[PDB]
């Protein structure tokens, strides 16, 4: 239960959740549809994820669950928005058959109006396993 990220001119690398717990942490306190209260989300920047395996951020990527369902994500959300990579949901780990290892968190709570929508909601890939550019 990796995350694959595949890089244009390099080796595809495998990235473990210990490989995303030793970059710099992020988080974020949000309500979400998913959820029965707010929530308290631990992960990586995927600008910060992206910039350190790809060396820059590309204009579209693709992120793929386990069940092969994909869905893109632009820069300029990223750099609006500044979604994580969570790998801890109220400090725990989050179970590989639930949502787990990792899920696509936007910060909705701090952008209500432009976030609580099914267009953004569809971005937030749970049972994240591949990243690839669009
Ligand atoms: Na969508």
Redesign the pocket.
């Known amino acids: 239960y990796n995350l694959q990220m595949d890089i244009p001119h390099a080796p595809t690398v495998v990235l473990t959740v210990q490989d995303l717990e030793q970059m710099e942490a992020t988080q974020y306190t949000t309500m979400l549809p998913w959820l029965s209260a707010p929530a308290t989300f631990t992960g990586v920047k995927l600008s910060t994820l992206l910039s350190q395996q790809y060396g820059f951020i590309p204009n579209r990527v693709t992120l793929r669950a386990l069940n092969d369902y994909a869905?893109d994500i632009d820069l300029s959300d990223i750099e609006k928005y500044q979604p994580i990579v969570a790998y801890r949901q109220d400090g725990k780990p989050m179970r590989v058959r639930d949502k787990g290892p990792f899920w696509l968190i936007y910060p909705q709570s701090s952008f209500p109006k432009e976030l609580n929508n099914?267009?953004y909601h569809?971005?937030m890939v749970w049972q994240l396993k591949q990243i690839h550019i669009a």
Do not use: C, F, L, V
């Open positions: 869905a099914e267009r569809s971005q």
